[PDB]
Amino acid sequence: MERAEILGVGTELLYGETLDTNTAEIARSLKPYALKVERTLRVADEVAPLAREVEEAFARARLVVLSGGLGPTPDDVTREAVALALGEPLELDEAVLGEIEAFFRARGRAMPEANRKQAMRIPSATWLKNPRGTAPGWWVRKGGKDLVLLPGPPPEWRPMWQEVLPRLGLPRRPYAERVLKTWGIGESEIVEVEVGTYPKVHGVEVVVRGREDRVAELAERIKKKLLKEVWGEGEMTLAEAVKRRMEREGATLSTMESLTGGLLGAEITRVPGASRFYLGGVVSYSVGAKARFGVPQDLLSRTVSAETARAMAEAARSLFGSTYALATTGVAGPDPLEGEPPGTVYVALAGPTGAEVRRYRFPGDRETVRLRSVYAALALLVT
Amino acid sequence: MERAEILGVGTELLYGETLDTNTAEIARSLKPYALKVERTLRVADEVAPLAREVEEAFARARLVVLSGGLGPTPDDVTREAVALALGEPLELDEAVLGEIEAFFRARGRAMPEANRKQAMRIPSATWLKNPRGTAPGWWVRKGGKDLVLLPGPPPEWRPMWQEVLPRLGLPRRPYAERVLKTWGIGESEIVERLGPLFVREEEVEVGTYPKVHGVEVVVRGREDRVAELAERIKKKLLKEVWGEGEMTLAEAVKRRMEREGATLSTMESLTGGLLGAEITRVPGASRFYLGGVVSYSVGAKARFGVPQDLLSRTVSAETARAMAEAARSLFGSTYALATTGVAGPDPLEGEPPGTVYVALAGPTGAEVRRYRFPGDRETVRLRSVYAALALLVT
Ligand code: NA
């Protein structure tokens, strides 16, 4: 089996100032292909060491993928390092220049001198169009091997890489993964090709991976064994599950939040099409705010309670006129509140036939508790 | 300046099934020493590729550090690979084999035969004690070079590494670094402004890192060069620098509210509550943040004060101003932030994705800033959050 070599470029990656997920993510995209990944690299922003690593990686590999260092500054030196590794001169493409120029003009700017170098390429390189940035990528086909240069930011490289990957003509292998996403059941209970369990803030994922035939058969048997706990598969998320229920019913949604601070509204609206059902929300972070939008005076001294969660959901529902409304209240941490520890949370749903509350006691730090709270609220609608 | 190579062993680190933070953490620990980290590797659990990588890393470096693959599984092959790469045989340390039996004996169990592996060392290796797990590591000194094998789990390796590092005899170099966080200025403009201040040399280097929260500028290297150079750069970037070091925008906004005795509220469209979420990330937000509304539908925009004539152009500077002034009046806060715009993937009101207006209303009036952010939907949302926060700290 031939090798794929994957290099992330950036000194800040070495030190984990920015965490290298790009190389990992590209390696994962390569599993359906019959290439071996023996190693991945993160390389500092220096021309000579980078050219050496690129030269060596290309020498031993069917495929080399580089990610990062395509910006306009003196620390972006990937194009120079690759040209040096392949013994080709860099040459300015006037058509690409016009396009960078147009990119800046739309934004009401003139094109800075330093961006000119992003329109440079070696003669062996075909351009990869960057739909979201000024630096197009490269695709070098040479001696039966492929070298691909990609931008560092994921919104640029993801669409680029999806487009070019099939075109590389790599040998395929029948690998697959199936992800079953559950809620409200611990790892231990679940236990009662390879099958793994993965605890996340949105619930425990059951992952089945390996030979596509065996993945297919096995995954069906497991989903059956976990039929009521499974809320979605693959790319499905709780927010998207909510959106599907809302559109099915022609229903609307609104929210009132305290400890989640607006994170619940943020997670609902993350999904395209949220405007078809989501009317809006209130972040009632102070006592004054809670009263002003409908929570009864009698409850304002006991905010960490089932009664308050219920009252907040009712108040949001009457304020927005939505079919359904979700509310969050409780203790995110680090401090206790009203004698209750961090991770003490009540989520509530108000709908046509009344309200329901669930209490949770969530482990984790402040941000973790906020996240688990957001997903517990969405789970009221889809579990 | 001599090289330090750092290898993380484990096939799952490649695919990010376990996030590799060990190599970066080892790399940071090397900062006070005059060694160059040109690269770090993650290597699969396979003896021949690993031996090759170790062999190459050791030939080019003053120091090689390996992390992981010291267990009892067939997939734990680091000891072998190193023995192979360095041209020395694996030798069984009887005592160590004892210590390992004691580990299992203190748990009610007899030692599995698999764990026998863990008592092999090469002649060049002296042991590094692991009182917190099964496998001890190695310190190998050879040809004036050092090679170290560390266990994978951090509670195990951190103490070990902390004890052996000051014994390696590495050249020392007084190190400093300075991180400047800017907003409202692109990388190309920073390059032009800094000119020859954008030094990249062996003694000291300047780097720029574009983030959703603005361009970060880092100066690192020799302590005596870093202070002065960083200061000159700060001077050139003065009005655009909002924080240093560990500082975050949300923390910066918290400092200004506490300093003034002032309160804050928000009104959000495209960000959907993400601005309030970011503000309340910081412990102690309730001392100043009164709350906010997410006016996602047209009906909710009108309910919370957006003028009816503006509802055909919610993506505009006039609307942003109106939103910020409405939240201010509605919550009685000293300040209010607003966001309005087009997240993507579709246009809205004829305006393309990335079109964003953020506004701030306060005691002396209101102001609005306009942006055309590239990125996907989640990116534009995030940029808008930080753009709104930057209004209060410029
Ligand atoms: Na880049």
Residue numbers in the entry:
A (entry chain B): 1 to 192, 204 to 394
B (entry chain A): 1 to 394
Task: List passages from the publication reporting this PDB structure.
Here we describe the determination of the crystal structure of CinA from T. thermophilus (TtCinA), which contains both the NMN deamidase and COG1058 domains and is therefore a bifunctional enzyme. In addition, we show that TtCinA adopts a three-domain structure, with a third, previously unidentified, KH-type domain between the NMN deamidase and COG1058 domains. We demonstrate that TtCinA adopts an asymmetric dimer and present structures with NCN, ADP-ribose, AMP, and ATP bound, which provide experimental validation for the modes of substrate binding proposed previously. We use these structures to propose models for both enzymatic activities and suggest that large scale movement of the COG1058 domains is linked to ADPR catalysis as well as providing a rationale for the usual asymmetric arrangement of the TtCinA dimer.
